Design a binder for these strands. Sequence first.
DNA 1: GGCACAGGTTCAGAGCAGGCGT
DNA 2: ACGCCTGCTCTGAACCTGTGCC
Lengths: 155, 53
Amino acid sequence: DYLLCCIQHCLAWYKNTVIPEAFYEDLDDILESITNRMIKSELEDFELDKSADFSQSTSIGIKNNISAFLVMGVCEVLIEYNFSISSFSKNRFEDILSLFMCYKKLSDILNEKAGKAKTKMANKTSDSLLSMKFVSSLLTALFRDSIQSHQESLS
Amino acid sequence: MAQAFESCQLDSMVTAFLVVRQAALLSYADWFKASFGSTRGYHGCSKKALVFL
DNA sequence: GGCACAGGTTCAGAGCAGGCGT
DNA sequence: ACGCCTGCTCTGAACCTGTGCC
């Protein structure tokens, strides 16, 4: 999770200030691939919701709870990657939606399993890995953009 | 067969199948029902091992 | 009937109000 | 009336109950 966050943020830095030489051109495509294959991996590839019920006593449910938080963070760093590269591409905003759809499916699943026991699981209320930078620039464009060239992709 | 469905490769599967078939000449059916018991229910953890089979 | 927020309660100790030797 | 010791008052922390809602 954090490693993807690190690579993403270093990557954005590298594009922005350094460029104005094979490793980064590779890494762009690494992430693009990781996105495209993560898009169509529906938790039976990661053994979740049916093969696991994330029971925090069992070694399997605890391992599910570890890998689940990894992928939630992973999805988020890719939300960042997707948005960052492209100047408002409606394909890549659908990519962002799909990463969130995976994260949000893990969200409402872990809400179902947190609805039975007491609300002591503050591991689900662990911080996002996003630079505040991001939360600003996302919210900027979500609430304060009337630019019609962006507007179809932000809808 | 374990190696073959861990990697989900048909080459070693085909080898094992033809091996048991020539070993028969109903030992094929014996080995098949042995597979059906706690091998063929989960060849791989993913149920695409069934699709390759 | 269970699921959840708010209240008050017991604690546990810091740190100073004041009774008591010369 | 000044020095010495103690015990009381405040302060917040954590505990678990107590009651309202669906």
